[PDB]
Design a protein around this ligand. Structure first.
Ligand SMILES: *[C@@](C)(CO)[C@](*)(O)[C@H](Cc1ccccc1)NC(=O)[C@H](Cc1ccc(OC)cc1)NC(=O)[C@H](C)NC(=O)CN1CCOCC1
Ligand SMILES: [Mg+2]
Lengths: 212, 231, 222, 195, 240, 244, 235, 233
C-alpha cells in the first residue's frame, strides 16, 4: 500500500492505490482501499488486508449505531477514537492497520485523523500511510499549498499515488480518487496506472527516467 | 391447592400440579393432527388467528431434512424445544455423519422436559408437540407432553377438541396405515381427520397447514394456495 | 515440537461468465512426496447455487466448508427459508475465517455462483478473511502458474488491438461456457506439467440458473 | 515521543515537550502536544511507547477530573503524583505494562509553592528542581547543574530552557521539531506560543 | 447471589415496589426546576426541624455531575448518592471516548436507564429517588431541564417540581409560567423559583437553597443573604 | 423452595419506607446515649455505657468510643459487634487513601464510603442492615473540625452538636438551648456532661458509666491530638464541673 | 408469596397476564400497513402542560427500513430497542444485507420470556414493529411480552385499543393509499384520545421502500390534521 | 504438545469386489528397542468395521476404549442396535475424525494415523484414513507410515483406479496384502514378522485372522555378497 489524504481550501482530497501483496506475489490489482462509512465519512486502509477490511467495516457498524442512539452523525474525532481504542485492546497481538479517518461535520469542519495498530492517534492536515508513503510525501509536500483549486488538488493526490505506484514495488494497480466537501464525499473515478502513467508522462513531460 | 406453588412440590395423592397446569395450556391450544403409513408421515395443523386483521399462528416447524413437528400451547416453548432438536439433529450429522433417529429425538425431548419438573426456580414447558420423521427404520410419529412422557403412535391429535380427530383415526387405523406410495391420499385422510375436531368454523385456504415427510420426500410445509387442493 | 499445520497441495480455479460461473479443482491429495488419493474432491455444492473450495491444508479446508454448509442451513431456519445471496455468503465466510485470526485456517478459499442480477460471480479469500469479487481467480499451490495466464486470456491483459500502435486495448467481453472450460482444462494440464502437487484428475462444477452440473477430466498421474 | 523537560523556579514550573511524532523513516507530525491538564494547577507531560502514552495520560486525566467533581476540590500536586506513581507501580507487574514516563508540574495553592515530579514507567517518583526523561537528561542535567539557581524568575527560567533546547538541537541525532513550552503558576496553566 | 424478584406485576397491572418508591419521593423535601431564556435555576427545600446543623460540611442538595450539568433530587438521600456517583463516572467516560462532554439529554437518559434496570433486576429494589437534571449542552446556549423517576421514564420540562407538596408548587408554576415568554433574565427566573417555593416552604431563612446554572460551565450557588433579599422583595410586593 | 422463608429485607412499605431500616433505628433508640459537640478549637465525644455492673473491668474496656485513625474517631450507638465490622472497614479505607495519595483521608470521604456500605445493605443482597449509628468526630486541613452522623439507612449529615441513641429528643433540645458558635472545648466538655446528666435513665451519673474523648489542637504548634479519657481522668473532670 | 414463572389453573403465566394489564393502561398506538407503505401513529399523553411534549419519544427508529411504536411501561422498551438496533446492525455486518422484519421481531421476542428465578419480570410494554424487506414487502408486527408476535394489516394497542381495533376492522381494505392510511390513523386516534387531538399531543411516522423510516414533523402532521377535519365536514 | 513413546508401525489396506482387507503387524516399538511383541493394532467394532491404528500405543489404547464405549452408548434405548440402527463404518470414522481434529486444534493431539475399513449396510465398501492432524482422505488403497511408501505402489498395481475394484477378487487382494507385509518386513526397521489380517466381506462378513507370519522369504542370495567393493574373500 500507499494511501494519502490532505486538507486544503476546498475540503479534503483522499487518494489510494489498489494493489494487494503476499510477499513478492501480486495478489490483486483491483482492491478497494477506501471504505465509505457514511455520506460524510471516509476511511483509508493500509496494512494487513483482513484486519483493515474487517475492523473498518466493523467501525461503520459502530458509527451507524451511534446515529441511531444519538439521533446525530458521529464526529470524525469520536469515530477515529472508537477504532483507536479497539486496536489498543489488541496491542501486541499482531494487528496491522494504518488508517486515515477523513470526513466533515458541522462542529469540526473538514478533519483528518491518522490511526494505527500500535495505538497512535493524530489529528493533522497532511498524512501519507503505507509501504510507499515516502514516495507520495516527496511529490505531495513539494507541490502542496493551502490555496490549491479542487481541480489541482485532485490531480496532485492522483499524481502522488502514481509516483509511489511507480517506485514502490508493493504499490500500484490503479488510483481511487475522492473529494470530501461540506456536502459529503464525492467519488472521482478509478484510474488505471497502465494508461495513466503514459498519459501523465506525455502531457506533463515528467518521468524522464523511463524509456519513452 | 397448597401444593401447586412450584414444580418441586408433590401433592398428598402424589401429583405435580404445575406439570398438570402446563398440560392444561395444551388443551387451550389449537388442534393439530398427526398420522403415518409405512412410506410417509403427515402433520395437519389448524392454525389460529387473533382476528380477521391478524395472521394465522404458524404451528409446524422444521427440525431437519427428515424430521419436524407441529405445536399446541405456548409457541415460544415450542421454539425453544424445536431449536434444541435442530441442534441435536445437527450434532448427529456433524459428529457421526448420521441422521438422528426419531426415537432418540423423543428420548432427548423427554429428558429435557424432565429436568424442568424436578428443580426449584424453573417451570415445566407449556406446550405439546407432534414429531414426525423418516429414518432408517421407516416412517415415525411421536407425541410429546411436557410432563416428559413421549409416545410413538400410528396416529394421534392434540389441542382443543382433539378427541374427535383421535376417535376417527382409531376407526380409520386399518385404512390409512396401508396408504403406501401415495402422499395425496394420506394427506386427504389427515385433512378428513382434523375435520372431525371442527365446530362452526371450516377449513379455508389461509387457515389450514399441512406438512409431510417420506421415503423420497424431504420434510416440507404447505401453506396458502398450496393447500387449496385438499379443501 | 508438534506442528498443527500441513500442506495437502493441489490447486483450484474460478471463472465467471455472463449467466454462469465455474469452480474447478484437481482431485489429487498429497503429503510431502507421497500421494494420498488420486480422487479426493475439494469443490463442493453448498446449496443455494453456491459452490465452494478451501484449498491448502485439507483438515482446515474440510472444517471450513463443513461450517459454511452448516451456516447456510441455519440461515434458512432463522430467516424463513430465504436464499443466501453470493455476496452475503462471502461476508459470512469472512467472519468464519477472521474468527480464527490468531490461529488461522491455512486455506485459500474460493466460492462461485450467481449474483442477484443473475450474473456470474466469483469471490476469493485469504486465510484470515480478506475477500474481493473478481471475474477470475486461481488458488492453491499452482496459483502462481495459472493466475497470470487467466489475466491474459480472461481479462485480456497486455493485449492491444492490432495496428492501433498499442493505443486501443482489446475490448473486454464475457466468455461462453465452452470457451471457459477450454481455458480451465488447458490451465490444469499446464499446471500438471510443471507442478508436482498437481495432477491425477480435474473436477469442474458449473453453476447456471438451472442448477449445479459436474464435469470430470483425467490428468497426468506422475 | 522523545524529549520532555521540566524546570521548577521560584514561583512557577515550566514544562518543555518536543513536537515531533515519528514512525519509521517518516515524521508524521511536527506540532504534537505531549501533555494533558490533570487539573487547573497541575500539568503532566509524557513520553514512551506509542499508543500507551496518550492512553495513560487521558486515563489519569479522567480520574483526577472525576475526583475534582466528586469533592469540588483540587487535589495537590503531591497527591496527584502519588496517585500517578501507584498506577505505574501496579502497571509494571501487569500482563502488559504501560511503557510511559511522565513529568508532573504543578502549583500547590495551599503552600504557594511550585512543584516538579519525575516518574518513570516503573513507578519511580522523585521531586526535583529540574527533570528530564530519555536521552535529554544526558545533556540537560549537567547544563542545569551549572546554570540553575533556585531563586530564578519565570523569564530567567525560559532563558535557561532556551539554553537546553539549543544544546539538544546541536548534539541530538534526531530532529525533534522544536518544543511546546507551558508554564504552571498561581494563575494556572498557559502556553508560550512563540518559542 | 440474592436473586429474588422484588419488583413484580400485580393482578391490576401495577408494579407496587416502583409505586412505593414514588411514595418515598413524595415524602422527600421539595425540589423545583425553572428554566429561563438564557438560564436554568434549581430550587430546593431544606426542612427546619434540624437546628444545630453544620451547613459548611452537610451534603448540599444540588450536585454537580460535570462542570456544565447539575442534578438535584427528592427522595431517599442515601440512594441519590449512588445515582450521582454513577452519573459522574459516565460523564468522565463520555469525555474519554467521544472527546466531548455529555449532553443533558444523554446524561438524563443514562441516569434514567440505571433507575429502570433496578425495576427489573433480581435481588434489588428500585431507587426511591426522582431527579431534576439541568444544564447546557457543549457549545450551546439553549437551556435544558429534564426529570427522571424510579420507573425509569424521563422527559423534558419548561418548569417542573418534585417531592413533598410538589402538586401545590406545580399548580403555581402552571399558571405563572408562560411558554411564549419565559423569564428573560437571571433575576426574573430566580424570583419565580423562590416565589414557587414560598408557596410551600414555611420561612425564607435557611430553608431555601438556590443554584443558578448558565451557559459554558457557569454554575454558582447563592448564599443566605442573596436569597433572603428575594424573600424580602416578594413579601413586600405581596402585601397589596 | 427457600422463597417461603425469605423475610425480604430490602423492600418498600406501601407508605414508601424501608421496614428494616426503620426497625434498626428503633433498636438504636434503646442504646446508650452518645453525644458529639464541635467547638471552634476542638471536638468533644461523650457516651454513656449501657447499665454497668460493679464487676465490669472499666479501665481496659472499649464499648462506645473507637479510633479510626490519628485524626478521626467515632462514637457508637447500637450493636457493638456490627459497629466493629464497619470500624475495621473504615480503618482500612483510611489507610488505602493514605497509601494512594500520601495524605490523611478527608473526614467526609471516609464518612461517605462507610455510609455507602450501609446503603448497599438496604437496596440489595437480601441481608439485614447494620444496627448501628455513628457520630464521626475528626479533623482535616480543608474544613477543619467536623462532626457527622450516619444511620442504618446510609444517610449522613453534618452537625455542630448532635446526639444518637436513647433520649435524643430530650438531648437535642438541651444542646439547642445552651450551644453557641464561639464556644471553647472546655465549655463543650461541660455541656456534653450536663446533657448526659439530665437525659440519663440512671439515678446519678458516675465515672464508671462513661466514655469520654476530645480532639484538640492542644498539642505543640499546628497539630491534632486525640485524647481517650482514662477512668481517673473522667473522675476528675466530673468533679471539676461539679456533677459529683 | 409465589413463583415468578408460575402457571395458573387455566394454563397461563400469571406474570405475563398481569403485564398485559399494564399495557392496557398505556397510551394508544396505532399501525396500518399498505402496499405504498406502513404508517405508525401514537398518543403522546403529557401528564402536565409544563412538560415539553416534543421530548416524548414513543416512536423509534430501529434501522432505516424498520420502525417501532410502543405502549405501556415505556421505560422497559429502552433495552428492547437497544437489542433490536444491535440485532439489525449485527446482521448487516455478518451478511452484508438488510435484515428481514420478521427475523428482527423474532429476535426481540426471544428476550420476552427470558425472565425468572435473566431479568426478574416480563416487560410491561407492547411494541408495534413496522418495516419493509424485498421478500415479504411492507409488514406490521405486534410484539407482546408473552414472546408471541402476530403480523397485522392494521393494529391498535393501548388504552383505546379494543375501540380502535373495531374501527380498523371496518375501514381497512387491501387497496389503501398511504395518504388515506395517514388520515385513518389520525381519525381513529382523535376518536379514542381523552384530550383533543393536535400536532403537539399526537405523532405520526411512516416507512417506505424509497425514503425509509421517517418520523413526521409537527408542521407536516398539522396539515394532515387540517386536511382530515375538512374531509369529514365535506359529507 | 506430545512426543510418541511406545509406537506401532504401518497399517495397510485395500478394496476388492465384495469388500475390504486391512492388516497390521503385532509390534510395539520403544524407539529402536522392539519392546512388545503381542500387540493387536486391528480393533473390530461390531461385525462390519475394523479400525487399524498406527503411532502412539497409549493413545491407541485410549481410542480402543472410546470405540468400546461407543458400542455401549449406541445400544442404549435402541431396539435396532443389532439391525437398522447398528454402528456403520462411516459413523465410526466421522466420530474419530471429529476427535482427531478437535485434539490437534487444542494443541494436544492423539499421536496416531488411523484407517477405518468396513462395509456399509447397503453393501458399499468403506475405506478412509485420518491422522493426528485431522487430515482425512479415501482411496482404493490406503496405508500409514512406511506402508504409504512401499505398500501402496504394490497395491495400486492391482487396483489402480475405481473401475479395477469389481475386477479384483478376495484371493488376489489378500495375496497382494500378504506380499506387501513381507516387503515391509524386509525394509522397515521397526516392523515384525508376526501380524494380524482382517477381511470384511459383504457376503461372508468379518473374518479376523491372528498370528500370521511372513513366509517364502528370499535370503539365499546373501551368501554370494562379499565386502562393499573390491573385497573378494
Ligand atoms: C500494501 C500492498 C502493502 O503490502 C497495502 O498495505 C495492502 C493494503 C490492502 C488493503 C485492503 C485489501 C488488500 C490490501 N496490504 C496488503 O496487501 C497486505 C500486506 C500485508 C501482508 C501481511 C501482513 O502481516 C500482518 C501485513 C501486511 N497483504 C495481505 O494481507 C495478504 C493479501 N494476505 C496475507 O498475507 C494473509 N496473511 C495475513 C497475515 O496473517 C496470515 C495470513
Ligand atoms: Mg510421480
Amino acid at each position: 500500500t500507499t494511501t494519502l489524504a490532505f486538507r486544503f481550501q476546498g475540503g479534503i482530497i483522499v487518494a489510494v492505490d489498489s494493489r494487494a501483496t503476499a510477499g513478492n506475489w501480486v495478489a490483486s490489482q483491483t482492491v478497494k482501499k477506501v471504505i465509505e462509512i457514511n455520506p460524510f465519512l471516509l476511511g483509508t486502509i493500509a496494512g494487513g488486508a483482513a484486519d483493515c477490511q474487517f475492523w473498518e467495516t466493523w467501525l461503520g457498524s459502530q458509527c451507524r449505531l451511534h446515529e441511531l442512539r444519538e439521533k446525530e452523525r458521529i464526529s470524525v474525532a469520536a469515530a477515529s477514537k472508537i477504532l483507536s481504542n479497539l486496536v489498543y485492546q489488541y496491542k501486541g497481538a499482531g494487528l496491522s492497520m494504518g488508517t486515515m479517518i477523513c470526513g466533515y461535520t458541522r462542529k469540526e469542519g473538514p478533519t483528518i485523523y491518522y490511526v494505527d495498530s500500535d495505538g497512535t492517534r493524530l489529528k493533522g492536515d497532511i498524512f501519507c500511510v503505507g509501504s510507499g508513503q515516502t514516495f507520495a510525501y516527496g511529490v505531495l509536500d513539494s507541490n502542496y499549498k493551502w490555496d490549491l483549486s479542487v481541480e489541482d488538488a485532485l490531480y496532485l493526490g492522483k499524481r502522488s499515488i502514481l509516483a509511489a505506484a511507480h517506485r514502490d514495488a508493493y504499490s500500484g494497480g490503479s488510483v481511487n480518487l475522492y473529494h470530501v466537501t461540506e456536502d459529503g464525499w464525492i467519488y472521482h473515478g478509478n484510474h488505471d496506472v497502465g494508461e495513466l502513467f503514459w498519459k501523465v508522462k506525455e502531457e506533463e513531460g515528467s518521468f524522464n527516467n523511463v524509456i519513452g | 391447592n397448597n401444593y401447586d406453588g412450584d414444580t418441586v412440590t408433590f401433592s398428598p395423592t402424589g401429583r405435580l400440579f404445575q406439570v398438570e397446569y402446563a398440560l392444561e395450556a395444551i388443551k387451550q391450544g389449537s388442534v393439530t393432527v398427526g398420522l403415518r403409513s409405512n412410506t410417509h408421515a403427515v402433520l395437519v395443523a389448524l392454525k389460529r388467528n387473533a382476528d380477521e386483521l391478524s395472521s394465522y399462528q404458524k404451528k409446524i416447524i422444521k427440525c431437519d431434512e427428515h424430521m419436524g413437528l407441529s405445536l399446541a400451547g405456548l409457541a415460544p416453548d415450542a421454539r425453544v424445544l424445536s431449536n434444541y432438536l435442530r441442534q441435536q439433529c445437527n450434532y448427529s450429522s456433524l459428529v457421526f455423519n448420521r441422521k438422528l433417529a426419531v426415537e432418540r429425538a423423543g428420548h432427548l425431548l423427554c429428558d429435557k422436559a424432565q429436568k424442568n419438573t424436578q428443580s426449584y426456580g424453573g417451570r415445566p414447558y407449556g406446550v405439546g408437540l407432534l414429531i414426525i420423521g423418516y429414518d432408517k427404520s421407516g416412517a415415525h410419529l411421536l407425541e410429546f407432553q411436557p410432563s416428559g412422557n413421549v409416545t410413538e403412535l400410528y396416529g394421534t391429535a392434540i389441542g382443543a377438541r382433539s378427541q374427535g380427530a383421535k376417535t376417527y383415526l382409531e376407526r380409520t387405523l386399518d385404512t390409512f396405515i396401508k396408504i403406501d406410495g401415495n402422499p395425496d391420499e394420506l394427506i386427504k385422510a389427515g385433512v378428513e381427520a382434523i375435520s372431525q375436531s371442527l365446530r362452526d368454523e371450516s377449513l379455508t385456504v389461509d387457515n389450514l397447514s399441512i406438512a409431510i415427510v417420506g421415503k423420497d420426500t424431504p420434510f416440507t410445509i404447505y401453506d396458502g394456495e398450496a393447500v387449496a387442493k385438499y379443501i | 515440537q508438534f506442528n498443527p499445520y500441513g500442506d495437502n497441495g493441489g490447486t483450484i480455479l474460478g471463472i465467471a461468465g455472463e449467466d454462469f460461473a465455474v469452480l474447478a479443482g484437481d482431485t489429487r491429495n498429497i503429503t510431502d512426496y507421497s500421494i494420498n488419493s488420486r480422487y479426493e474432491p475439494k469443490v463442493f455444492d453448498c446449496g443455494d447455487n453456491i459452490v465452494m473450495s478451501a484449498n491448502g491444508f485439507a483438515a482446515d479446508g474440510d472444517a471450513l466448508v463443513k461450517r459454511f454448509k452448516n451456516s447456510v442451513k441455519w440461515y434458512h431456519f432463522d430467516h424463513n427459508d430465504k436464499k443466501l445471496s453470493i455476496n452475503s455468503a462471502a461476508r459470512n465466510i469472512q467472519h468464519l475465517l477472521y474468527g480464527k485470526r490468531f490461529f488461522p485456517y491455512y486455506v485459500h478459499t474460493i466460492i462461485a455462483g450467481l449474483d442477484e442480477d443473475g450474473k456470474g460471480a466469483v469471490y476469493s479469500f485469504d486465510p484470515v478473511g480478506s475477500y474481493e469479487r473478481e471475474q477470475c481467480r486461481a488458488g492453491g499451490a499452482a496459483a502462481s502458474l495459472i493466475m497470470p495466464f487467466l489475466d491474459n486470456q480472461v481479462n485480456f491483459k497486455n493485449q492491444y488491438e492490432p495496428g492501433t500502435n498499442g493505443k486501443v486495448k482489446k475490448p473486454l467481453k464475457y466468455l461462453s461456457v465452452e470457451e471457459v472450460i477450454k481455458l480451465v482444462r488447458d490451465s490444469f494440464t499446464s499446471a500438471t506439467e510443471r507442478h508436482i502437487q498437481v495432477g491425477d484428475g480435474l473436477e469442474i462444477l458449473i453453476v447456471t440458473k438451472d442448477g449445479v452440473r459436474k464435469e470430470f477430466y483425467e490428468l497426468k498421474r506422475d | 515521543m522523545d524529549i520532555i523537560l521540566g524546570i521548577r523556579v521560584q514561583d512557577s514550573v515550566i514544562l518543555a515537550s518536543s513536537k515531533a511524532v515519528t514512525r519509521g523513516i517518516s515524521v508524521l507530525k511536527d506540532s504534537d502536544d505531549k501533555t494533558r491538564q490533570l487539573s487547573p494547577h497541575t500539568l503532566m507531560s509524557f513520553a514512551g511507547e506509542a499508543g500507551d502514552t496518550v492512553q495513560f495520560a487521558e486515563y489519569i486525566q479522567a480520574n483526577i477530573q472525576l475526583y475534582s467533581i466528586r469533592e469540588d476540590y483540587e487535589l495537590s500536586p503531591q497527591a496527584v503524583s502519588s496517585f500517578v506513581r501507584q498506577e505505574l507501580a501496579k502497571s509494571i507487574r501487569s500482563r502488559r505494562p504501560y511503557q510511559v514516563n511522565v513529568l508532573i508540574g504543578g502549583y500547590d495553592k495551599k503552600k504557594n509553592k511550585p512543584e516538579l515530579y519525575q516518574i518513570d514507567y516503573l513507578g519511580t517518583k522523585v521531586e526535583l528542581p529540574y527533570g528530564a526523561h530519555g536521552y535529554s537528561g544526558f545533556y540537560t542535567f549537567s547544563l542545569l547543574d551549572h546554570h540553575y539557581r533556585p531563586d530564578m524568575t519565570t523569564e530567567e527560567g525560559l532563558d535557561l530552557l532556551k539554553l537546553c533546547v539549543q544544546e539538544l538541537e546541536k548534539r541530538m541525532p534526531m530532529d525533534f521539531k522544536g518544543v511546546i513550552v507551558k508554564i504552571v503558576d498561581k494563575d494556572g496553566i498557559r502556553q508560550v506560543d512563540d518559542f | 447471589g440474592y436473586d429474588r424478584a422484588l419488583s413484580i406485576f400485580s393482578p391490576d397491572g401495577h408494579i407496587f415496589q416502583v409505586e412505593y418508591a414514588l411514595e418515598a419521593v413524595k415524602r422527600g423535601t421539595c425540589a423545583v426546576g425553572v428554566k429561563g431564556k438564557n438560564c436554568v435555576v434549581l430550587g430546593c427545600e431544606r426542612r427546619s426541624t434540624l437546628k444545630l446543623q453544620d451547613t459548611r460540611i452537610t451534603p448540599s442538595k444540588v450536585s454537580k455531575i460535570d462542570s456544565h450539568v447539575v442534578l438535584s433530587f427528592s427522595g431517599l438521600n442515601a440512594d441519590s448518592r449512588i445515582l450521582i456517583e454513577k452519573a459522574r463516572v459516565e460523564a468522565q467516560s463520555h469525555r474519554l471516548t467521544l472527546e466531548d462532554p455529555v449532553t443533558v439529554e444523554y446524561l438524563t437518559r443514562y441516569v434514567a436507564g440505571v433507575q429502570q434496570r433496578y425495576t427489573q433486576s433480581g435481588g434489588v429494589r428500585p431507587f426511591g429517588v426522582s431527579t431534576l437534571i439541568a444544564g447546557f449542552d457543549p457549545r450551546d446556549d439553549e437551556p435544558k431541564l429534564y426529570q427522571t423517576e424510579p420507573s425509569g421514564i424521563y422527559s423534558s420540562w419548561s418548569a417542573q417540581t418534585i417531592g413533598r407538596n410538589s402538586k401545590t408548587v406545580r399548580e403555581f408554576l402552571e399558571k405563572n409560567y408562560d411558554r411564549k415568554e419565559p423569564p428573560a433574565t437571571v433575576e426574573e427566573c430566580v424570583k419565580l423559583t423562590v416565589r414557587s417555593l414560598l408557596e410551600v416552604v414555611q420561612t425564607g431563612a435557611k430553608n431555601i437553597e438556590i443554584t443558578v446554572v448558565k451557559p459554558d460551565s457557569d454554575i454558582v450557588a447563592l448564599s443566605s443573604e442573596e436569597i433572603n433579599q428575594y424573600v424580602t422583595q416578594i413579601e413586600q410586593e405581596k402585601q397589596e | 423452595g427457600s422463597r417461603r422463608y425469605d423475610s425480604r429485607t430490602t423492600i418498600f412499605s406501601p407508605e414508601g419506607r424501608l421496614y428494616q431500616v426503620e426497625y434498626a433505628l428503633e433498636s438504636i433508640s434503646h442504646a446508650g446515649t452518645a453525644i458529639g459537640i464541635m467547638a471552634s478549637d476542638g471536638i468533644v465525644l461523650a457516651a454513656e455505657r449501657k447499665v454497668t455492673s460493679t464487676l465490669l473491668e472499666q479501665d481496659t474496656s472499649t464499648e462506645k468510643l473507637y479510633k479510626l485513625n490519628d485524626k478521626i474517631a467515632v462514637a457508637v450507638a447500637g450493636l457493638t459487634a456490627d459497629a466493629e465490622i464497619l470500624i475495621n472497614t473504615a480503618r482500612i479505607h483510611a489507610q488505602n487513601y493514605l497509601k494512594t495519595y500520601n495524605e490523611d483521608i478527608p473526614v467526609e470521604i471516609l464518612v461517605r464510603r462507610l455510609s455507602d456500605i450501609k446503603q448497599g445493605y438496604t437496596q440489595h443482597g437480601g441481608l439485614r442492615p447494620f444496627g448501628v449509628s455513628f457520630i464521626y468526630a475528626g479533623y482535616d486541613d480543608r474544613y477543619g473540625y467536623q462532626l457527622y452522623t450516619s444511620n442504618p439507612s446510609g444517610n449522613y449529615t453534618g452537625w455542630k452538636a448532635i446526639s444518637v441513641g436513647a433520649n435524643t429528643s430530650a438531648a437535642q433540645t438541651l444542646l439547642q438551648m445552651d450551644y453557641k458558635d464561639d464556644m471553647k472545648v472546655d465549655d463543650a466538655i461541660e455541656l456534653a456532661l450536663k446533657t448526659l446528666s439530665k437525659t440519663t435513665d440512671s439515678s446519678a451519673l458516675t465515672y464508671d458509666r462513661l466514655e469520654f474523648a476530645t480532639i484538640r489542637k492542644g498539642a505543640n504548634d499546628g497539630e491534632v491530638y486525640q485524647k481517650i479519657f482514662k477512668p481517673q481522668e473522667i473522675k476528675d473532670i466530673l468533679v471539676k464541673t461539679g456533677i459529683t | 408469596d409465589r413463583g415468578v414463572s408460575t402457571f395458573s389453573p387455566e394454563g397461563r403465566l400469571f406474570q405475563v397476564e398481569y403485564s398485559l394489564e399494564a399495557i392496557k393502561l398505556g397510551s394508544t398506538a396505532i399501525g396500518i400497513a399498505t402496499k405504498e407503505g406502513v404508517v405508525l401513529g401514537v398518543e403522546k399523553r403529557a401528564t402536565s402542560p409544563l412538560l415539553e411534549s416534543d421530548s416524548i419519544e414513543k416512536i423509534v427508529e430501529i434501522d432505516r427500513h424498520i420502525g417501532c411504536a410502543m405502549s405501556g411501561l415505556t421505560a422497559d422498551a429502552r433495552s428492547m430497542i437497544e437489542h433490536a438496533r444491535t440485532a439489525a446492525v449485527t446482521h448487516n455486518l455478518y451478511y452484508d444485507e438488510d435484515i428481514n422484519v420478521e427475523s428482527l421481531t423474532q429476535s426481540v421476542c426471544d428476550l420476552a420470556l427470558r425472565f425468572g428465578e435473566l431479568m426478574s419480570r416480563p416487560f410491561g410494554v407492547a411494541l408495534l414493529i413496522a418495516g419493509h424487506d424485498a421478500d415479504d414487502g411492507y409488514q406490521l408486527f405486534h410484539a407482546e411480552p408473552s414472546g408471541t408476535f402476530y403480523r397485522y394489516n392494521a393494529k391498535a394497542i393501548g388504552s383505546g385499543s379494543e375501540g380502535a381495533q373495531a374501527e380498523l376492522l371496518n375501514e381497512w381494505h387491501s387497496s389503501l393509499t398511504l395518504k388515506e392510511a395517514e388520515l385513518l390513523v389520525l381519525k381513529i386516534l382523535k376518536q379514542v384520545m381523552e384530550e383533543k387531538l393536535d400536532e403537539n399531543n399526537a405523532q405520526l411516522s411512516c416507512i417506505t421502500k424509497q425514503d425509509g423510516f421517517k418520523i413526521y414533523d409537527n408542521e407536516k402532521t398539522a396539515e394532515l390534521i387540517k386536511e382530515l377535519k375538512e374531509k369529514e365536514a365535506a359529507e | 504438545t506430545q512426543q510418541p513413546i511406545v509406537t506401532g508401525t504401518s497399517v495397510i489396506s485395500m478394496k476388492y469386489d465384495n469388500g475390504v482387507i486391512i492388516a497390521a503387524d503385532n509390534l510395539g516399538s520403544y524407539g529402536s528397542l522392539l519392546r512388545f511383541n503381542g500387540v493387536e493394532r486391528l480393533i473390530p467394532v461390531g461385525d462390519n468395521t475394523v479400525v487399524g491404528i498406527s503411532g502412539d500405543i497409549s493413545d491407541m489404547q485410549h481410542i480402543e476404549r472410546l470405540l468400546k464405549d461407543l458400542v455401549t452408548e449406541n445400544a442404549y434405548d435402541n431396539p435396532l442396535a443389532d439391525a437398522e440402527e447398528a454402528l456403520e463404518p462411516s459413523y465410526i470414522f466421522e466420530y474419530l475424525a471429529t476427535v482427531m481434529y478437535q485434539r490437534r486444534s487444542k494443541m494436544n493431539p492423539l499421536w496416531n494415523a488411523i484407517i477405518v475399513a468396513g462395509v456399509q449396510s447397503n453393501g458399499d465398501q468403506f475405506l478412509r484414513y485420518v491422522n493426528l492432524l485431522g487430515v482425512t482422505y479415501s482411496s482404493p488403497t490406503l496405508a500409514t507410515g512406511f506402508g504409504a511408501h512401499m505398500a501402496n505402489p504394490l497395491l495400486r498395481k492391482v487396483v489402480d483406479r475405481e473401475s479395477d475394484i469389481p475386477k479384483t477378487t478376495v484371493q488376489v487382494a489378500e495375496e497382494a496384502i500378504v506380499n506387501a507385509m513381507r516387503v515391509l518386513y524386509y525394509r522397515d526397521a521397526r516392523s515384525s514378522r508376526n501380524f494380524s489380517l482382517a477381511i470384511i466381506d459383504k457376503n461372508t462378513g468379518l473374518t479376523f485372522k491372528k498370528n500370521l507370519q511372513v513366509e517364502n522369504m528370499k535370503w539365499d542370495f546373501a551368501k554370494d555378497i562379499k565386502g562393499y567393493g573390491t573385497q573378494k574373500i
